[PDB]
Homo-oligomer: A and B are copies of this chain.
Amino acid sequence: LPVPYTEAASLSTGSTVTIKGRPLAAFLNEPYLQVDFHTEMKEESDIVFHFQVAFGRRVVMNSREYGAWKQQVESKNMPFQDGQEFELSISVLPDKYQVMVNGQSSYTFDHRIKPEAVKMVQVWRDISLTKFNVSYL
């Protein structure tokens, strides 16, 4: 898939976003991955859920509300493996997003804005992408 990858989407409780891909560099070179749930089709729109992996180092999550970044949450959990593909699954729960990596629950992020505000998902920075799927149950 082309990266940056953009897909229109709608989310509610029970939605799952599944991303499958590979970093474009060895962890020694510190590639990044960014997944942004946007409120409008435009890249400059607000971000309900920002998920940013510094491969081999940390994860930060945040929201961008009326143009401004809010309270950053950091996690040093690093289930991604150097030089390997990954399967990333982001589930919408009533109270939070749950982020699974390779089948393992790894991060969560409480809703700051209703997920029904999402209109677009963008996946970008230093990855190649083989699948992107949004599914509802």
User: Is A124's CB within 8 Å of the partner chain B?
Assistant: yes
Contact A44 B26 (CB under 8 A): yes
Contact B126 A124 (CB under 8 A): yes
The total of chain A residues at the interface (CB under 8 A) is: 14
Nearest B-chain residue to A29, judged by Cβ: B43
Q: How many copies of this protein are present in the complex? A: 2
Contact with B along A13-34 (1 / 0, CB 8 A): 0000000000011101100100
What's the least CB distance linking A64 to chain B, in Å? 9
Residue of B24, B29, B44, B126 near A29 (CB, 8 A) is B44
What's the least CB distance linking A84 to chain B, in Å? 16
Nearest B-chain residue to A27, judged by Cβ: B44
What's the least CB distance linking A18 to chain B, in Å? 23
Within 8 A of B (CB), among A38-84: 43-44, 67
User: Is A125's CB within 8 Å of the partner chain B?
Assistant: yes
CA distance A25 to B43 in the complex (A): 8
User: Is A4's CB within 8 Å of the partner chain B?
Assistant: yes
